[PDB]
Design a protein around this ligand. Structure first.
Ligand SMILES: O=C(NO)c1ccc(Cn2ccc3ccc(C(=O)NO)cc32)cc1
Ligand SMILES: [K+]
Ligand SMILES: [K+]
Ligand SMILES: [Zn+2]
Length: 353
């Protein structure tokens, strides 16, 4: 029962040349890593080396044109970096962004390999920039390549094509890119919880609604749990896991679990407006560990309150390491509406609901 950890300070180099206080801060990963050290979690883990993803690996999910353009930013002048970033929705680019994105994805590849070859049982990836908004052909929402999506396809490439991967995305935002890459796929189950507000919360698309259940062979294998009209917290996320995430996950029977673990639904995050506690995140993690013979990889996505993300992700690693889940209640009626809309939408596909 070994827990793996990947972290590389070089991922700090990606930065916003025109706003040094932009919330997607280099110090997000350094503060998380320092907290793991202070709580003596880092020393209990097997340290997994970071590496660069290759261009061929990026092609598992991304087009050659998208790869080529982000790769070209390594040599761009500031004016061109500013212009290129402005072509995307909510993106800033520095000369180091491309290599930092490659390191984020390659770090998760080595961790997935460590889990699947049996070097470790589960692992945590402290990485940036994030991934789950990136699409096959575009960058978006602070994301250049879809790290989680690439890790599922990489895991299949070193095992078998039909390896069953569950991606649970508990970042407060919908992972539009992850949904789209796998929308027609029945080997990768995508389950996202996210603030939605009738499509008015970023990324501002009705793609995130409960009635997007997948396409073709992928019908049933895309589960959107959208939140409306309420500051949601531990009881809503616990209830969503009880009624939706875990029954569906168990019937899918994943062989590997990836968590797109944004912590911008955490109490104290200005971008999320929610109040999931560190104890709540620990309970979510502990529930996922009952799947896939414990093969769970926790991947940092969003999360912008430096203290909140450090405490929340540390609680997740503590659960992975086997520590007892900490001690933690009527739901907002809006959350009941949301959960029951997902249940009605997915009853045709999941007999255990
Ligand atoms: O993925 C993320 N975090 O993990 C993420 C990605 C992109 C953005 C874009 N963005 C940046 C400032 C800002 C303000 C308001 C809205 C808004 O309200 N739109 O409706 C959006 C905004 C935010 C968060
Ligand atoms: K999400
Ligand atoms: K899918
Ligand atoms: Zn987010």
């Amino acid at each position: 029962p070994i827990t793996g950890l990947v972290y590389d300070q070089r991922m700090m180099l990606h930065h916003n040349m025109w706003d040094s206080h932009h919330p997607e801060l280099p110090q997000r990963i350094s503060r998380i890593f320092s907290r793991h050290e202070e709580l003596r979690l880092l020393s209990r883990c097997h340290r997994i080396p970071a590496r660069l993803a290759t261009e061929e690996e990026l092609a598992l999910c991304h087009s050659s044109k998208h790869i080529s353009i982000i790769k070209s930013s390594e040599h761009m002048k500031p004016r061109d970096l500013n212009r290129l970033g402005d072509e995307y929705n909510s993106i800033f680019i520095s000369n180091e962004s491309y290599t930092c994105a490659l390191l984020a994805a390659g770090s998760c590849f080595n961790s997935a390999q460590a889990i699947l070859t049996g070097q470790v049982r589960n692992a945590v990836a402290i990485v940036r920039p994030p991934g789950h908004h990136a699409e096959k052909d575009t960058a978006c929402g602070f994301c250049f390549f879809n790290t989680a999506a690439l890790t599922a396809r990489y895991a299949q490439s070193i095992t078998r094509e039909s390896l069953r991967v569950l991606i649970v995305d508990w970042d407060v935002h919908h992972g539009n890119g992850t949904q789209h890459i796998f929308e027609e796929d029945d080997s990768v189950l995508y389950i996202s919880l996210h603030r939605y507000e009738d499509g008015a919360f970023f990324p501002n698309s009705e793609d995130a609604n409960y009635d997007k259940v997948g396409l073709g062979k992928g019908r049933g294998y895309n589960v959107n749990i959208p939140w409306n009209g309420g500051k949601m917290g531990d009881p809503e996320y616990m209830a969503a896991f009880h009624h939706l995430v875990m029954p569906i996950a168990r019937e899918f029977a994943p062989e590997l679990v990836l968590v797109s673990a944004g912590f911008d639904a955490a109490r104290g995050d200005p971008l999320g407006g929610f109040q999931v506690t560190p104890e709540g995140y620990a309970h979510l993690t502990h529930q996922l560990m009952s799947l896939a013979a414990g093969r769970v990889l926790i991947i940092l996505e969003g999360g912008y309150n430096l203290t909140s993300i450090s405490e929340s992700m540390s609680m997740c690693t503590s659960m992975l390491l086997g520590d007892s889940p900490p001690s933690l209640t009527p739901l907002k009626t809006s959350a009941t509406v949301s959960i029951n809309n997902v249940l009605r939408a997915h009853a045709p596909f999941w007999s255990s609901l």
